[PDB]
Amino acid sequence: LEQESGTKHARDLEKMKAQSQGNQQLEITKA
Amino acid sequence: LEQESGTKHARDLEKMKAQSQGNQQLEITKA
């Protein structure tokens, strides 16, 4: 079910999107 | 089915395209 519906992809895609969003911390504080 | 139709490739191709698009954050804020 996870693979058929693309749930695993959305599970994976939304994962490192947070990792990319983790770099927001540096420019939030220093700007 | 995923491999025959190229779904797995499009699953993989659209994955790190977001990772490449993750670098847009740096130039969005600092420009």
From Swiss-Prot, chains A, B:
Q: Tell me which positions the record assigns to the signal sequence.
A: none
Region entry Disordered, spans: 6-31
Indicate where this protein resides in the cell.
Virion
- Where is the sequence biased in composition, kind Polar residues? 18-27
Q: Where is the composition biased (Basic and acidic residues)?
A: 6-17
Q: How does it assemble?
A: Homododecamer.
Q: What does this protein do?
A: Forms the portal vertex of the capsid. This portal plays critical roles in head assembly, genome packaging, neck/tail attachment, and genome ejection. The portal protein multimerizes as a single ring-shaped homododecamer arranged around a central channel.
Protein name (database record): Probable portal protein
Encoded by which gene? 59
